[PDB]
Design a protein around this ligand. Structure first.
Ligand SMILES: [Zn+2]
Ligand SMILES: [Zn+2]
Length: 578
């Protein structure tokens, strides 16, 4: 616990709650430093709920909608992993340093501007803060501190969701992080063209083509191993290797970035709620020098970086460049440098890495049992036993990637398309959830419209979703603009957040701007656009044939009329069901 780095933030919080501040001698924190406590003080989308009655009795759908916060913390966040051996550490540094240099070959780091940040907040209480000059003054005071060598307010607010913990920060802390490290996103350092293995900037509509491209590279099976709680396994050594990017920055920019890396990444201070007696609630103040603070501006890019480093190392272990003697200490580094310069880029191209999600196509199946460095780095695989060899896939269409699987389908004319797919319950369940209280029928209907148009663009091949989306679009006024967000994923490019005709938008995305679509002939009607095969639609959770779903479909126009009565019969509506 570096008090000379975290003390100022702790004193600032203590001053703001001096009368209630206490030190709970019986706090539950084991692997987090405890500093003290103080006395601190979802909804359904009715439109989507009304048009999806068969999914009220489906637990896979309804399940999506301080006691719960502490549960997530004690189980997956309050853990400590042993440090990797010295040789593992030298290998991680060497590959990270090689990777930053490859990524920086055709790109130079740069500072991101106040106006770039504002153009971002206007694109996606929140909008009023950047328009107020008092916010930019607080930002300026915190930057002053950062350049001197201190931090007062870059403090996290942790919210547990019972699965994962989401770490919040005030808009000001995120602007400062964006200013110094946002260039990784804005300039696509993790884009496929620049990184080889990255997929940043590609929509879910292109990810299948990436996997299909990888399936054609000679080698072993495709491996898609998830790491159990990736963000909680980011070690202090991963953070120092990620911060090597500062060596490519000019002094001024370097000072801003080193401050972010020191206070937001490497010496975190966090506020967390905890249930107290007589229904009362406390806020604890805790600190940690490792783990990823999930939900931060460059979380995705940095996770992508470290994941590419982990897969290059696993491939080096598999190819026998690294042996079990290299874990304890790496005596000769020359073999690693030679493997990176000769094979580095070829191995990057055999990967698709999106944050903590990866698919690797190795040169043979020795990759399945190359686990010694993977386990020494603390990157333990999900659900499987630590030393049980990984199971790879033969069919790229069955490979999991970004919570999806990809399928080749055929248009009525014979052209093939590669579509994203996932279990329907997850999609319907997510669309039934509305974030925000006091929500007007307009905002709820507009969010419903965004979900329906997203389904039309990406999940058009699911029979239930095509029907449900058309009923939503028939119940919401035509001129009402879609609002909100249907996903947090960087693969959600929001082409559906528009009032442009969805068949025109489908054509732009699947035909015109699809490089994997050779023949550019437009598709002029929805019936030309295919569904999955009944067996596959059923496997991924379809209710086609199921009695309540059939009644739902038979009564759908009546249901649409009821929603139109509630929104208002004076509004203008289009019938997308006919
Ligand atoms: Zn700060
Ligand atoms: Zn599927």
């Amino acid at each position: 616990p570096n008090m000379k780095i975290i003390g100022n933030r702790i004193e600032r919080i203590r001053s703001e709650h001096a009368e209630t501040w206490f030190f709970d001698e019986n706090h539950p924190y084991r692997t987090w430093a405890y500093h003290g406590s103080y006395e601190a003080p979802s909804l359904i989308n009715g439109v989507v709920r009304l048009l999806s009655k068969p999914w009220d009795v489906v637990t896979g759908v309804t399940g999506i909608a301080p006691y719960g916060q502490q549960r997530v913390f004690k189980e997956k966040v309050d853990t400590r992993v042993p440090d990797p051996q010295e040789g593992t550490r030298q290998v991680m540094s060497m590959v990270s340093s090689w990777l930053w240099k490859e990524l920086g070959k055709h790109k130079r780091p740069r500072v991101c501007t106040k106006e770039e940040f504002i153009n971002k907040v206007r694109s996606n209480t929140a909008v009023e803060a950047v328009n107020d000059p008092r916010f930019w003054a607080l930002v300026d005071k915190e930057r002053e501190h950062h350049l001197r060598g201190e931090c007062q307010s870059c403090v996290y607010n942790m919210m547990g969701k019972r699965s994962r913990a989401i770490w919040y920060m005030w808009l000001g802390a995120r602007f400062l992080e964006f200013e110094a490290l946002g260039f990784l996103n804005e300039d696509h350092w993790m884009g496929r063209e620049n990184s080889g293995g990255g997929v940043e900037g590609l929509g879910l509509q292109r990810l299948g083509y990436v996997l299909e491209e990888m399936s054609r590279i000679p080698g072993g099976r495709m491996y898609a191993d998830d790491t159990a709680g990736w963000d909680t396994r980011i070690s202090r050594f991963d953070l120092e290797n990620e911060a090597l990017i500062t060596n490519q920055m000019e002094k001024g920019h370097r000072a801003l970035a080193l401050a972010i890396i020191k206070y937001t990444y490497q010496n975190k201070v966090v506020k967390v709620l905890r249930p107290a007696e007589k229904g009362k609630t406390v806020m604890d103040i805790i600190s940690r020098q490792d783990q990823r603070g999930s939900g931060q501006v460059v979380t995705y890019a940095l996770n992508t970086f470290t994941n590419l480093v982990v897969q290059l190392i696993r491939n080096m272990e598999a190819e026998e460049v690294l042996e079990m003697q290299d874990l304890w200490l790496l005596r000769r580094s020359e073999k690693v440098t030679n493997w990176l310069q000769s094979n580095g880029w070829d191995r990057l191209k055999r990967m698709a890495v999106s944050g903590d999600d990866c698919v690797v196509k190795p040169i043979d199946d020795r990759f399945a049992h190359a686990l010694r460095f993977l386990n020494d780095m603390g990157k333990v695989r999900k659900d499987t036993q630590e030393w049980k060899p990984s199971t790879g896939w033969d069919n790229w269409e069955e490979v999991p990637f970004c919570s999806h699987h990809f399928n080749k389908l055929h248009l009525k004319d014979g052209r093939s398309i590669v579509v994203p797919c996932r279990h329907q319950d997850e999609l319907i369940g997510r669309a039934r959830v509305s974030p925000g209280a006091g929500w007007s029928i307009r905002e709820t209907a507009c969010l419903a419209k965004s979900y329906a148009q997203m389904w039309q663009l990406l999940y058009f091949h699911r029979r239930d979703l095509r029907l449900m989306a058309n009923a939503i679009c028939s119940s919401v006024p035509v001129d009402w603009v879609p609002t909100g967000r249907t996903t947090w994923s960087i693969h959600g490019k929001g082409e559906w957040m528009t009032t442009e005709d969805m068949l025109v938008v489908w054509n732009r995305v699947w035909i015109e701007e699809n490089d994997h679509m050779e023949d550019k002939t437009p598709v002029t009607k929805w019936t030309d656009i295919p569904y999955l095969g009944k067996r596959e639609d059923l496997w991924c959770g379809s209710l086609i044939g199921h009695r309540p779903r059939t009644t739902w479909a038979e009564n759908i126009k009546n249901t649409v009329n009821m929603v139109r009565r509630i929104i208002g019969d004076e509004e203008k509506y289009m019938d997308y069901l006919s």
